[PDB]
Design a protein around this ligand. Structure first.
Ligand SMILES: [Zn+2]
Length: 46
């Protein structure tokens, strides 16, 4: 089972959804499609 750790890396594009980081925008965009794309466990409030 996956684990949890701190300090992943600083990138010019962070995912306010989960907290991920992508050196490039195009990337963060393809990832965010996972939050709005489906209906996970409470993605966001507003
Ligand atoms: Zn995310």
């Amino acid at each position: 089972g996956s684990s949890g750790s701190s300090g992943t890396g600083e990138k010019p594009h962070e995912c306010r959804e989960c907290g991920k980081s992508f050196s490039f925008n195009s990337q963060l965009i393809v990832h965010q499609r996972i939050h709005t794309g489906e209906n996970p466990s409470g993605p966001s409030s507003g």
